[PDB]
Design a protein around this ligand. Structure first.
Ligand SMILES: OC[C@H]1O[C@@](CO)(O[C@H]2O[C@H](CO)[C@@H](O)[C@H](O)[C@H]2O)[C@@H](O)[C@@H]1O
Ligand SMILES: OC[C@H]1O[C@@](CO)(O[C@H]2O[C@H](CO)[C@@H](O)[C@H](O)[C@H]2O)[C@@H](O)[C@@H]1O
Ligand SMILES: OC[C@H]1O[C@@](CO)(O[C@H]2O[C@H](CO)[C@@H](O)[C@H](O)[C@H]2O)[C@@H](O)[C@@H]1O
Ligand SMILES: [Mg+2]
Length: 580
DNA sequence: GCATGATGCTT
DNA sequence: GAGCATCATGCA
């Protein structure tokens, strides 16, 4: 039942047709400077397997890869593009990416290989990658015969599935979303990842040493106050010290045992001096283990750069994620952790970091979609939205809004931006679910348009089976009809929140595409380095800062036209820390 | 070795 | 709330 193909010893003309399904296999999860283990090509002339050493050395094949007029259909083209970039080879003409197509059709399926995408259309003549390569320590590239058949079968699947996937995308009015947004963005992400971000390793190592000293000191104080040594990082061992030896009250429990989360510890601080030290230990340990040690582990020793990998096909909101290292959660709230950003520097001499972020894009999107008169007017006046929200829900003038009032209004807005439940709000504000509900009710009284939107979108999700974003991204919500309160409730919150978060995701993605086109037209050397949800980070010659101050915000603010203005703040400096 | 729980960082 | 990590702990 095997599939016929040619195990080529050399590249031939028929292998270079103007349309083909192409597989450039990179098995390592992190594809940066990784091996390409095999190549498969499927076109009108047949199916072929090529050894990388020969194909990638062949002038004709390389030229074919870089020829934009020679169209290729692939799965996870970014992976191939980046691996090739590390080899000095350009990949152009990718007209269809099955990974992104499957992702847009249904992001909940978690499609991570050709077999999974193929199963969506009842095509199963291809094996899952895990079945071929294995997992974990058992992972390995199989003998050529097995490897070759697998790559050819993946190419064959891509060749066959392009049409049915494009047809459904078209039916969903998502064809442009794929071809004009996600695929072009994939190439931009490839460039960003390959460029990488330069790291001041000496700085990190310095901080690391200072942290180690501070950790040792606090660690000893903890054992001193506890009257014995124990594993502080062990909730079980810590729980015994706090709730048994010291008799602190148990305010919250977890499946396993006593909760020792920061939230719980804060409340116990008044009872014993050991508590504040545990909190301080947790903070220092977080910075040391996750950030300092974590970053140093993935920095390339030769260039001192980190090359993250953006997962463009994971979230059901349409936002991008980042891994190895995750550069979307570097500390900023507290000054101590914020200092870590001083370690991210420009990659060239006399260059600077330029960062631009949307100001409240989620709430502005909500104002637009819900057509709430009060919210739209607030943004048209460029009001401090948290202060404004406080004025309305607490019924007071601007000068009557106290700091605590603004903080709680901000939390209410935070809940709307991330679609948290009333229990979530209650927990965040440390108040009763009942009081949190009253805040929500007060908010809806002040923003009736938002209330109407929330009611209507849940109804629409139920009727159609999914909700959509500004650029037609879709999220199916089968749990919307569940008779299990918690399950149904979460689905309703996602129905309300996905159009907001998802539309904001669509906007910044388009902004990235528009920005790169503008940078090219303007002949600027400036280039994108990172995307952190509502923020874009670039680096460029110091001589280009003034031009970027006008160009970047303009492009970002004009990415789309909403019923309210889009506002972008920006700053630049010698390090990411200073770009604020 | 590897799965899962508790924890905490960002937006 | 999600996605990404950590370390500890159990088992396997
Ligand atoms: O290449 C990224 C792309 O690959 C998938 C699998 O198809 O994820 C793999 O690579 C990621 C980055 O190294 C890992 O986080 C993930 O664990 C691994 O399976 C897609 O999800 C992703 O879009
Ligand atoms: O020195 C390591 C040894 O100490 C214990 C406590 O007896 O844990 C300490 O060190 C760990 C690694 O530095 C921390 O994770 C932990 O929080 C700290 O108390 C033992 O578990 C370990 O064998
Ligand atoms: O009381 C109506 C109000 O309830 C919500 C949940 O807060 O939805 C419930 O009632 C709907 C009937 O109109 C059902 O479709 C839905 O499944 C049920 O949870 C709100 O959406 C609605 O405004
Ligand atoms: Mg912002």
């Amino acid at each position: 039942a095997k599939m016929a193909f040619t195990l080529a010893d050399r590249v031939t003309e028929e292998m270079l047709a103007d349309k083909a399904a192409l597989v450039v296999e990179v098995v390592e999860e992190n594809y940066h400077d990784a091996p390409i283990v095999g190549i498969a090509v499927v076109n009108e002339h047949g199916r072929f397997f090529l050894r990388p050493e020969t194909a990638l050395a062949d002038p004709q094949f390389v030229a074919w890869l870089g020829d934009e007029t020679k169209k290729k259909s692939m799965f996870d083209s970014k992976r191939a593009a980046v691996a090739l970039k590390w080899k000095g080879i350009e990949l152009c003409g990718v007209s269809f990416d099955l990974l992104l197509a499957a992702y847009l059709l249904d992001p909940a399926q978690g499609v991570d290989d050709v077999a999974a995408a193929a199963k969506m259309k009842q095509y199963e003549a291809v094996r899952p990658d895990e079945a071929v390569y294995g997992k974990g320590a058992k992972r390995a590239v199989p003998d050529e015969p097995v490897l070759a058949e697998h790559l050819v079968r993946k190419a064959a699947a891509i060749w066959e599935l392009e049409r049915p996937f494009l047809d459904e995308l078209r039916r969903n009015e998502q064809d442009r979303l794929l071809v004009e947004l996600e695929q072009p963005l994939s190439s931009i992400l490839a460039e960003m990842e390959f460029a990488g971000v330069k790291v001041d390793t000496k700085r990190l190592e310095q901080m690391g040493k200072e942290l180690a000293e501070q950790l040792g000191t606090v660690e000893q104080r903890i054992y001193e106050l506890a009257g014995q040594e124990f594993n502080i990082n062990s909730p079980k061992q810590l729980g015994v010290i706090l709730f048994e030896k010291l008799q602190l009250p148990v305010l919250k429990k977890t499946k396993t045992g006593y909760s020792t989360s920061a939230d719980v510890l804060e409340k116990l601080a008044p009872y014993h001096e050991i508590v504040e030290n545990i909190l301080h230990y947790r903070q220092l340990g977080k910075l040391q283990s996750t950030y300092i040690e974590g970053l140093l582990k993935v920095v390339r020793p030769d260039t001192k750069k980190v090359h993250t990998i953006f997962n463009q096909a994971l979230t059901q909101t349409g936002r991008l994620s980042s891994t190895e290292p995750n550069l979307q959660n570097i500390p900023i709230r507290l000054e101590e952790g914020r200092k870590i950003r001083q370690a991210f520097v420009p990659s060239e001499s006399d260059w600077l970091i330029f960062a631009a972020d949307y100001s409240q894009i989620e709430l502005r999107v909500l104002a637009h979609i819900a057509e709430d008169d009060n919210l739209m007017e607030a943004f048209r006046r460029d009001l401090d939205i948290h202060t404004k929200t406080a004025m309305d829900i607490f019924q007071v003038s601007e000068d009557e809004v106290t700091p605590n009032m603004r903080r709680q209004a901000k939390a209410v807005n935070f809940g709307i931006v991330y679609g948290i439940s009333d229990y979530g709000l209650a927990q965040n504000l440390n108040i009763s679910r009942k009081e949190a509900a009253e805040f929500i009710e007060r908010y809806f009284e002040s923003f009736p348009g938002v209330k109407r939107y929330m009611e209507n979108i849940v109804q629409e999700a139920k009727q159609k089976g999914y909700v959509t974003t500004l650029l037609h991204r879709r999220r199916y919500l089968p749990d919307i009809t569940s008779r299990n309160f918690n399950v149904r409730s979460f689905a309703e919150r996602m129905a309300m929140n996905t159009p907001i978060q998802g539309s904001a995701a669509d906007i910044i993605k388009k902004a990235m595409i528009d920005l790169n086109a503008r940078l090219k037209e303007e002949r600027l050397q400036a280039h994108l380095l990172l995307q952190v949800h509502d923020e874009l980070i670039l680096e460029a010659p110091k001589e280009e800062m003034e031009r970027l101050c006008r160009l970047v915000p303009e492009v970002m603010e004009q990415a789309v036209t909403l019923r309210v203005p889009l506002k972008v703040d920006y700053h630049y400096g010698s390090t990411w820390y200073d770009a604020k």
